[PDB]
Symmetry: C3
Subunit: 148 residues, 3 copies
């Protein structure tokens, strides 16, 4: 299979796809919270679910949206960087570690965010996960620059 175009690719695809699914889980949770708290973003939604007064903001809904937004700010760049990095012939174990640190850091981030864990737990998980991203970004820069 084309999944074996590089030794690091399967690990990357496993971690990335799990993270995409993790984002879908955040979307599902957001919808559930909207229904439970009766806090809808649109009048058409509110009118179907009890009346116009339910078109309103809710702190738990806003928190879910923040977690999802932070995912978009971090996981989407990883999908790009990790894919490219997989083809630069990195040491297989080193590549694994980059992907695993990102996966664990990001899952922990969502748990810390939605679970309202004390500071600086969420911030630490964010920083931890950004480290392999910074590392991959620099490696790609060098490889790209040297092939110009």
């Amino acid at each position: 299979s084309l999944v074996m175009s590089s030794p690091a690719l399967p690990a990357f695809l496993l971690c990335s796809t799990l993270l995409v699914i993790k984002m879908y889980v955040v979307a599902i949770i957001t919808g559930q919270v909207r229904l439970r708290k009766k806090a809808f973003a649109n009048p058409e939604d509110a009118l179907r679910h009890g009346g116009p007064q339910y078109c309103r903001s809710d702190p738990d809904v806003e928190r879910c949206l923040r977690a999802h937004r932070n995912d978009m700010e971090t996981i989407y760049p990883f999908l790009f960087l990790g894919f490219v990095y997989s083809f630069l012939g990195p040491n297989p174990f080193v590549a694994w570690m980059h992907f695993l640190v990102f996966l664990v850091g990001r899952v922990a981030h969502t748990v810390a965010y939605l679970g309202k864990l004390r500071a600086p737990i969420r911030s630490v998980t964010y920083t931890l996960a950004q480290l392999p991203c910074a590392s991959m970004a620099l490696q790609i820069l060098w490889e790209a620059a040297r092939h110009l």
Copy 2:
């Protein structure tokens, strides 16, 4: 051409690029609504377009931003998943159907959102489009896992 690296790739690239253009259309509409409703996000914009009182929120602008955000939550993962999935040798017709259901579902979503269609029309289109994404995500998981 490298567009023929896999039988499903041309269909994927057609649908994905149309969806990117569809997002650009949402951005264009957002700008048009800001100008028509005189609702700008920045004081520098407002001062150029009639005065400081026009740095303000507007429900139609907010709706446009929600549609665009929902696109980012769904179309961006599809760009990743669909690209990878194209290289897993899926049945050409089955792959076509995954891409077409996503394309139709997402175009319908934007129409339902910006057109303020009654509930649950928008929600149904969202769910419909997520189905092929879930399907592709699971298929990638199995392929990645089995190549570890």
Copy 3:
């Protein structure tokens, strides 16, 4: 290296990775502004940094978030379009120009946004950067369609 799979790829990877790093810079700035202005999005953050009254919005924080969001609306599609476009055998110099115009336009956009430059400076930089994206999108459409 696989970075040489197409003549335009190294230039694309250089520009894209610089833009990802530029987004990370926006994230770093956002955090710094939150701390300086004592404007946190979460009560757990606020309580660690001086008290519950510091869970509040701030116009400079909101501006940073807008810049980051606009980046997600524009740079993420470029990561997709530019990657695909690199493999369509475009003229090397023409491809370079597409990538450079996007890079310069987007860096200028962030400077214009965060620097609060007068209108329509930011809007012009946005439009300039979208031009090569529109161009690449259409080229991909034709290539994909003709391979169906």
